[PDB]
Design a protein around this ligand. Structure first.
Ligand SMILES: O=P(O)(O)OC[C@@H]1O[C@@H](O)[C@H](O)[C@H](O)[C@H]1O
Lengths: 33, 620
C-alpha cells in the first residue's frame, strides 16, 4: 500500500501478477486523455 | 515524379515542431542516418520551425555541433531562465546536410532533481526505476527536462503557437508521457523502430513468430528485469495522439505486444544523390575482385574466372538473426547440385562480419605478395617485349619470336614459377581467430565440408575485419566492393528494417531478402511480380527451416542458371528502382502522420481528409 509498494518499485520487486501489473497504470493514465 | 508538394496543401501558419530523439548530434545507433537524411526535406517543408531535442555530449559538440545564438527573444528568455534555474542548456546548429536548429540538454547537470522527479513520476503514472540501470535514469531526466522546456516555451510566449512534439524511442517516451500528463497544448507523435521485447524473446525462446497471440507480455518483462522499460515504452505508446511504426512486421509486433495498432507505417529512406555519384564502376570492381581472388587462390587456379559468381552477406555478427546458417547450408546444397550436374559455374561467397581477431594469417599475405610479384614480372616482360617488337617492326621485319626472351627474362619467369608452388589448400578465413573452437561460422563450414578443394564448385571467403580503403589486402571501402558483387543474400530472421539490403538494392545489385523484414514486406507490397526486378523474397513466416532452406537453394540455383543477357536485363531493372526508397517519396508518410497529430490535438483549427492513395506492375 503506497509507500511499501513504492519501495518494492525502487528495489525492483514488482508483483506483476497483481498491483504492479500494467493494467493499474492503464486505468490511472486513461483519465488524462 | 511525386514531390512533397503534391496534394498536402494545408494552413501551417505559426506552427513549431520538435524532433525529440536521444541520439541527435550523438552517433549511437542506425536511425542516426535516418534523422540526418530526413532533416533536409523536413526543414525545407518547415522553414525555420524545425528543432531537435537531445542530450549533450562533449565529443559530439566538439566534432559536429556549432554553438550559435537563438534567433528569437522567446528562446533567449527561455534559455536564460533554464540556465538560471539550476540546469545547463546550450543552443546551436547541427553540422549536417540540412543544417537544422538543435537544443542540447545536459543530463549530468540535473542530478540534484532526480530524487523529486522520480517521486513525481511515480505519483503521476506509478512508474519506478531501479538504481542500477544507469540508462533509464538518463531517459527519465531527458524526458523531465524536455517537458519542462516545452512548458516554459509555451508559457513564456506572448502568442501561443501550435507546438508539435515527435519522439522516436523509449529513452524519449518519458517526455511524451509527461507532456500528456500536464495537459500541454501539444500534438504528440510516437514512432518506434524496434520493439524492446522482440530482441529479448527472439534469442533463447523458440518460435517467437508463431506464438504472438500466446504471449502474456507482463511475465516475460518480469523475469528479465526489463519490466520498467517495457512499462514506460508501452505507456508512452498508449498516450500518443498518433502512433507510428517503421515497418509492417513491427506493426504486427507492436499490435500483439504493445496492444495498439499503429495508425500509419513510416518506412526509412535515404538520399540517392550521394550514392549515384552505371556499368563501368561495376566492371572495375569486378575486375579488382578478380585480382583479389587470383591473389588468394594462387596455385589452384583451375577454374574459369569468366563463369564465376560472387555472393556476399554483410552486417553485424548475428549468426541467427541474419540467418548465416541457412545461407551456409544452402550453399552446401548448391555445391552438391552443381557437382552432380557437372557445371562449369563457380560460386565465391563473401562473409563480412566483425569478429575478435588479432592479425592476418601468413597464407593470405604470402599469396598477395606472390600475385604482386607475378603482376610486376608480367608487366616488365610485356614492356620489354613491346619495345623489342616496336624496334624490330620499324625496320619492316617479322618478329623472330624465339629471340625476344633472354637469360634474365627466363630467370624472372622461373623465379615467379617457383614462387607459385603450394601443397596445401587455400584457407577459408583471412584472419587468426581468438575463439576458433567456439566460432559458429567456422564450425558450420567444417560440418558442411567446404574447404576450397579443387573439386569444390563453391568457395567460401570470410573477412571479419571492417572493410577499409587502407587495408593491406583489400584497400577498398564498403560501397565500391558492394557495387561489384553479383548478388546479396540476407536470410534474416528478426530485423525491424534492413539498412544493408536497402543499401544493396539502392546500389543496383539484385538481392534476396525475406518476408520477415521491413524491407522485404515493403518491396512485396509496393511492386507486383517482384522476381522480375531482381528481388527474391524468402517466405520464412509460414514455413519451417528446411522449407526456407530449400526455397533459398532453388532461388540461388535459378540465379546461377541465368545467361549473361538475362543478368544484364535484371540488373538494369534493379537499377531503375532506387527512387522508391528516397525521402522524396518516403517522407510523405511522416507528413501525413504530422497532419493526423494536428487534427487530433486541435480539431477546431485543423481538419484532415483520410487520403491513403500512396505502382510498378511489370517489365516482361
Ligand atoms: O543524354 P542524356 O539524356 O543526358 O543521358 C545521359 C545519362 O547521364 C547520366 O545520368 C548517366 O551517365 C546515364 O547513364 C546516362 O544515360
Amino acid at each position: 500500500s503506497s509507500e511499501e509498494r513504492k519501495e518494492r518499485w525502487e528495489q525492483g520487486q514488482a508483483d506483476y501478477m497483481g498491483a504492479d501489473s500494467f493494467d493499474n497504470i492503464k486505468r490511472k493514465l486513461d483519465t488524462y486523455l | 515524379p511525386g514531390l512533397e508538394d503534391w496534394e498536402d496543401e494545408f494552413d501551417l501558419e505559426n506552427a513549431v515542431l520538435f524532433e525529440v530523439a536521444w541520439e541527435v548530434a550523438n552517433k549511437v545507433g542506425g536511425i542516426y542516418t535516418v534523422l540526418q537524411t530526413k532533416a533536409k526535406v523536413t526543414g525545407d517543408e518547415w522553414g525555420d520551425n524545425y528543432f531537435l531535442v537531445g542530450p549533450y555530449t562533449e565529443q559530439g559538440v566538439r566534432t559536429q555541433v556549432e554553438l550559435l545564438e537563438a534567433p528569437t527573444p522567446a528562446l533567449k528568455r527561455t534559455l536564460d531562465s533554464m540556465n538560471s534555474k539550476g540546469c545547463k542548456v546550450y543552443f546551436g546548429r547541427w553540422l549536417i546536410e540540412g543544417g537544422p536548429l538543435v537544443v542540447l540538454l545536459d543530463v549530468g547537470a540535473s542530478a540534484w532533481a532526480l530524487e523529486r522527479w522520480k517521486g513525481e513520476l511515480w505519483d503521476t503514472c506509478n512508474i519506478g526505476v531501479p538504481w542500477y540501470d544507469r540508462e533509464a535514469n538518463d531517459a527519465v531526466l531527458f524526458g523531465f527536462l524536455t517537458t519542462w522546456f516545452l512548458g516554459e516555451f509555451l508559457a513564456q510566449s506572448e502568442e501561443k503557437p501550435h507546438v508539435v512534439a515527435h519522439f522516436h524511442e523509449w529513452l524519449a517516451g518519458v517526455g511524451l508521457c509527461l507532456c500528456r500528463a500536464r495537459r500541454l497544448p501539444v500534438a504528440t507523435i510516437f514512432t518506434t523502430h524496434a520493439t524492446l521485447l522482440g530482441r529479448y524473446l527472439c534469442a533463447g525462446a523458440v518460435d517467437f513468430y508463431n506464438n504472438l497471440e500466446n504471449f502474456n507480455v507482463d511475465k516475460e518483462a518480469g523475469e528479465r528485469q526489463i519490466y520498467h522499460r517495457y512499462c514506460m515504452e508501452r505507456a508512452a505508446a498508449h498516450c500518443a495522439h498518433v502512433f507510428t511504426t517503421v515497418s509492417q512486421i513491427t506493426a504486427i509486433e507492436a499490435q500483439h505486444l504493445l496492444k495498439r495498432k499503429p495508425d500509419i507505417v513510416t518506412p526509412n529512406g535515404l538520399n540517392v544523390k550521394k550514392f549515384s555519384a552505371f556499368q563501368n564502376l561495376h566492371a572495375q570492381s569486378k575486375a579488382r575482385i578478380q585480382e583479389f581472388v587470383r591473389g588468394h587462390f594462387y596455385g589452384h587456379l583451375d577454374f574459369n574466372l569468366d563463369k564465376t559468381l560472387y555472393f556476399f552477406i554483410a552486417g553485424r555478427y548475428e549468426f541467427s538473426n541474419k540467418g548465416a546458417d541457412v545461407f551456409l547450408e544452402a550453399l552446401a546444397r548448391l555445391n552438391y547440385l552443381l557437382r552432380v550436374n557437372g557445371s562449369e559455374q563457380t560460386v565465391v561467397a563473401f562473409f563480412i562480419m566483425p569478429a575478435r581477431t588479432n592479425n592476418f594469417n601468413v597464407e593470405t599475405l604470402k599469396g598477395q605478395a606472390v600475385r604482386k610479384q607475378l603482376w610486376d614480372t608480367a608487366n616488365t616482360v610485356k614492356e620489354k617485349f613491346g619495345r623489342k617488337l616496336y624496334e624490330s617492326l620499324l625496320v619492316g621485319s617479322l618478329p623472330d619470336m624465339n629471340k625476344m626472351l633472354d637469360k634474365e627474362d627466363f630467370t624472372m619467369m622461373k623465379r615467379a614459377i617457383f614462387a607459385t608452388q603450394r601443397q596445401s589448400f587455400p584457407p577459408v578465413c583471412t584472419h587468426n581467430m581468438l575463439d576458433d573452437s567456439s566460432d559458429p561460422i567456422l564450425t558450420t563450414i567444417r560440418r558442411i565440408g567446404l574447404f576450397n578443394s579443387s573439386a569444390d564448385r563453391v568457395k567460401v571467403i570470410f573477412h571479419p575485419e571492417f572493410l577499409s580503403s587502407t587495408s593491406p589486402l583489400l584497400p577498398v571501402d564498403y560501397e565500391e566492393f558492394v557495387r561489384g558483387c553479383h548478388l546479396g543474400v540476407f536470410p534474416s530472421y528478426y530485423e525491424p528494417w534492413g539498412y544493408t539490403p536497402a543499401e544493396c538494392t539502392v546500389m543496383g545489385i539484385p538481392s534476396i531478402s525475406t518476408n520477415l523484414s521491413g524491407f522485404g514486406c515493403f518491396m512485396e507490397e509496393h511492386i507486383a511480380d517482384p522476381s522480375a526486378y531482381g528481388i527474391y523474397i524468402l517466405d520464412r513466416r509460414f514455413r519451417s527451416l528446411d522449407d526456407s532452406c530449400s526455397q533459398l537453394t532453388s532461388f540461388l540455383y535459378s540465379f546461377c542458371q541465368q545467361s549473361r543477357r538475362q543478368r544484364i536485363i535484371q540488373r538494369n531493372r534493379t537499377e531503375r528502382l532506387s527512387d522508391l526508397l528516397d525521402w522524396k517519396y518516403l517522407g510523405r508518410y511522416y507528413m501525413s502522420a504530422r497532419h493526423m497529430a494536428l487534427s487530433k490535438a486541435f480539431p477546431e483549427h485543423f481538419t484532415y481528409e483520410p487520403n491513403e492513395a500512396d505502382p510498378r506492375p511489370a517489365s516482361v
